Amino acid sequence: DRPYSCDHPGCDKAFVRNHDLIRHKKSHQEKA
Ligand SMILES: [Zn+2]
Question: Zinc finger (C2H2-type) residue ranges?
Answer without folding.
Answer: 4-28
